[PDB]
């Protein structure tokens, strides 16, 4: 019901025990989730799975009421040793974004560690299509 | 200690408040973590670590003096505000390897808190001035014994 992960600060750089809390309330639905029903999405996924065993298949869309500009493709592959971070900055760059301009990414409604790979995200997170569901917004709470 | 009385106008309501403040009687409560790290640093990280997880609040937990109770391994932790104090309390009661029948107390300002809150009230509500929310534990109800 409660993982931790392990984060260094970045101003004072001992460890922060970062605790997240499984199955929390939100409002957001993936179009990708209503465009395609389960059982499509696991077969896509499953295949997936099999072609590239060093990516996690993620899917990235806007958070309700976020007011940042559109992501061209929403499906990735992305190495597991990749950082969350690193990725953070990949889609800020795919959205043209301006370096003062804030982005925040939701993993069930839960930022997730910048310290974590997208691996450990993946491997903590993926739904039952084997998918990884990252949400995206300018607020810190989406939605509003 | 000492009790002191002084009068201050109000800014929009502007009639005089008696203001009552106390110096050490009770005072405040001290924590290693404030010893080992400058106000400085403790301050920037804790605006870094609002900013970068707004969804969380940054707590430091630190055995009470005489308290007679198991150690804790980690000090600082990232707790999400919907997370409610009592749910935190049981966090940190597996954390100490205690027993079904052992107590657990909680000390925000020498004042236990409600156990009904969420963490992110708390931290609204007594956050000090390096963005870090400090609660004391110990086996015993009142904070020094």
Same mark, same amino acid.
């Given at each position: 019901?409660?993982?931790?992960?392990?984060?260094?600060? =970045?101003?004072?750089? %001992? +460890?922060?025990?970062? $605790?997240?809390?499984r199955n929390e309330p939100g409002?957001?639905?993936? !179009?990708? #989730?209503?465009?395609?029903?389960? =059982?499509?999405?696991? %077969? +896509?996924?499953?295949? $997936?799975?099999?072609?590239?065993?060093?990516?996690?298949?993620?899917? !990235?869309? #806007?958070?309700?009421?976020?007011?940042?500009?559109?992501?061209?493709?929403?499906?990735?592959?992305?190495?597991?040793?990749?950082?969350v971070g690193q990725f953070y900055?990949?889609?800020?760059?795919?959205?043209?974004?301006?370096?003062?301009?804030?982005?925040?990414?939701?993993?069930?409604?839960?930022?997730?560690?910048?310290?974590?790979?997208?691996?450990?995200?993946?491997?903590?997170?993926?739904?039952?299509?084997?998918?990884?569901?990252?949400?995206?917004?300018?607020?810190?709470?989406?939605?509003?």
């Amino acid at each position: 019901k409660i993982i931790t992960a392990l984060e260094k600060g =970045e101003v004072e750089e %001992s +460890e922060y025990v970062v $605790i997240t809390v499984r199955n929390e309330p939100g409002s957001m639905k993936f !179009v990708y #989730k209503e465009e395609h029903p389960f =059982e499509k999405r696991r %077969s +896509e996924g499953e295949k $997936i799975r099999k072609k590239y065993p060093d990516r996690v298949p993620v899917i !990235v869309e #806007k958070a309700p009421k976020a007011r940042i500009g559109d992501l061209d493709k929403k499906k990735y592959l992305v190495p597991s040793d990749l950082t969350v971070g690193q990725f953070y900055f990949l889609i800020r760059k795919r959205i043209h974004l301006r370096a003062e301009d804030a982005l925040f990414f939701f993993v069930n409604n839960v930022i997730p560690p910048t310290s974590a790979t997208m691996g450990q995200l993946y491997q903590e997170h993926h739904e039952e299509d084997f998918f990884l569901y990252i949400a995206y917004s300018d607020e810190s709470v989406y939605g509003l």
